[PDB]
């Protein structure tokens, strides 16, 4: 969750696709979905990122529809965007015990209880927050089973990006949990 604003520059794939869906939230535009192996993924747009400008037009007070309209009309060659990194999220760093636990319980991606004397307790992990990333890897839409797996097979130091449920629920509204599981970039970042 960086020091604020960054410029990214995009190029539509052969199909005229950048690989992005946008949702209007509190008179901002925010990233709803980033398609695996898309232009948007390569330049490194992420779930929950904010779009301030699109080719130097201010996005504030645009509808989800209009954001999408805008993206089409644009000359494919080069699209500049001004991004604010994942404003509604935070990153917590835990360390597993020798039982391999950070020390919390979740359900449908959402944390539901914290476990006395754990690292998640020591570090102030909060309930009623949905899990967004784990060790830099988007996990939104996976089954609770798989999210578990990634925490088993991570090292000692775990890093979890979280988002207030109320805000999370209001972003993923109008996107089926098939497209979530199918098409949302869940890959480790390319270098």
Q: Hey, what's the torsion of the CAs at 57, 9, 63, 133, to 10 degrees?
A: -140
| CATH match of 5-84 with 3.40.630.10 | no
Q: What does the block give as tokens for 150?
A: 């990634």
107 annotated as ligand-binding: no
Q: How many CA atoms lie within 13 A of 9 on its CB side?
A: 3
Do 5-84 and 90-183 fold alike per CATH? yes
What are the residue ranges of helices labelled H in the chain? 39-42, 64-73, 119-122, 144-152, 165-172, 179-183
How many angstroms separate the CA atoms of 119 and 96, rounded?
Answer: 7
- Beta carbons within 8 Å of 137's beta carbon, 6+ residues apart: 150, 186, 187, 188
How many angstroms separate the CA atoms of 95 and 158, rounded?
Answer: 6
Tell how strand 110-114 and strand 104-107 pair up: antiparallel
Q: How far apart are the first and last CA of the chain?
A: 19
What 17-25 contacts at long range (C-beta under 8 Å, 24+ apart), as own/partner pairs, is: 18/71, 18/79, 20/45, 20/71, 21/68, 21/175, 22/51, 22/64, 22/67, 22/68, 22/71, 23/64, 23/171, 23/173, 23/174, 24/62, 24/63, 24/64, 24/67, 25/167, 25/170, 25/171
Q: What does the block give as tokens for 182?
A: 């199918």
**Cβ distance 45 to 184 under 8 Å?**
no
Domain ranges of the chain: 5-84, 90-183
Q: Hey, what's the torsion of the CAs at 172, 176, 177, 180, to 10 degrees?
A: -70
144 annotated as ligand-binding: yes
49 annotated as ligand-binding: no
Of 7, 107, 93, the residue nearest 49 (C-alpha):
7
Query: Resolution to 1 decimal, in Å?
Result: 2.4
**What homologous superfamily does CATH list for 90-183?**
PDZ domain (2.30.42.10)
**Coil, helix or strand at residue 64:** helix
């Amino acid at each position: 969750i960086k020091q604020g604003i960054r410029e990214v520059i995009l190029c539509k794939d052969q199909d005229g696709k950048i690989g992005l869906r946008l949702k209007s939230i509190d008179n901002g535009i925010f990233v709803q979905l980033v398609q695996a192996n898309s232009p948007a993924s390569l330049v490194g747009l992420r779930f929950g990122d904010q779009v301030l400008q699109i080719n130097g037009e201010n996005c504030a007070g645009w509808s989800s529809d209009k954001a999408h309209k805008v993206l089409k009309q644009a000359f494919g060659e080069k699209i500049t965007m001004t991004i604010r990194d994942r404003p509604f999220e935070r990153t917590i760093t835990m360390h597993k015990d020798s039982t391999g636990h950070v020390g919390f319980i979740f359900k449908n991606g959402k944390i539901t209880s914290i476990v006395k004397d754990s690292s998640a307790a020591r570090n102030g992990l909060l309930t009623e927050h949905n899990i967004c990333e784990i060790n830099g890897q988007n996990v939104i839409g996976l089954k609770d089973s798989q999210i578990a797996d990634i925490l088993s097979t991570s090292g000692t130091v775990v890093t979890i990006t979280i988002m207030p449920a109320f805000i999370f629920e209001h972003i993923i509204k109008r996107m089926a949990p098939s497209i979530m599981k199918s098409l949302m970039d869940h890959t480790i970042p390319e270098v």
